């Protein structure tokens, strides 16, 4: 039947279709989440256990969106204990001073970093999708 190469290409087409399906589902779930909630589009510091992330919903796509660290992924403020008021306050400082460099789960993060965020664990995008 097909050569190993044709099957490999079939799997990259399948990854594209899967990522598209996942992005659309998460967009729709965002609209459903943002139905009756003010400040949904405003940055909040969220505790992921090991780190804080300043995040909100994107207004166009309704996808999760975080304050970005340079040209990499979301700025994850490493916590040194279960309760780390300093890390949380630095996250607040990020909201105040660094909020114009942002990164969004999905096709944006795919173009920018080579992964969508939704098919790797642990990752803030996947962790929100499990909530």
């Amino acid at each position: 039947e097909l050569t190993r190469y044709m099957r490999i290409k079939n799997t990259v087409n399948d990854w594209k279709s899967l990522t598209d399906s996942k992005t659309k589902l998460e967009s729709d779930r965002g609209r459903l989440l943002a139905a009756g909630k003010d400040d949904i589009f405003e940055f909040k510091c969220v505790d992921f256990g090991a780190y804080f992330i300043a995040m909100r919903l994107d207004k166009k796509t309704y996808l999760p969106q975080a304050i970005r660290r340079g040209t990499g992924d979301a700025w994850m403020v490493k916590k040194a204990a279960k309760v780390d008021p300093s890390a949380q306050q630095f996250c607040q400082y990020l909201i105040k001073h660094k909020s114009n460099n942002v990164i969004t789960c999905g096709n944006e993060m795919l173009n920018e970093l080579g992964y969508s965020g939704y098919f790797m664990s642990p990752h803030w995008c996947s962790d929100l999708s499990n909530m």
């Binding site: 340079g70 990499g72 105040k96």
Partner: protein, 97 residues
Amino acid sequence: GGTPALDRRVQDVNDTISDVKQKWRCVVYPGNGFVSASIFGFQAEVGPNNTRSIRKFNTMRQCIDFTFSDVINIDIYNPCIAPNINNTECQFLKSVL
């Protein structure tokens, strides 16, 4: 799975500090507003004659903005040791960390 992309050109003090009590955090100073505290003491300003006075702030915001800016050459007042040993201030420091 996979590894998150990390731009290490951007500095973050939280990367290396593994002891949570060594991190500066802003707390209510019950008497006078807000202060920047860690296990090392309080962030300080020059006292009456080349001494050390606790740096106070009226809002948590001003304390946070000071704490997490790159300003350096900042002195630390530690109430738990001499010189200037204040037992109650030391006890407060220990109780908020």
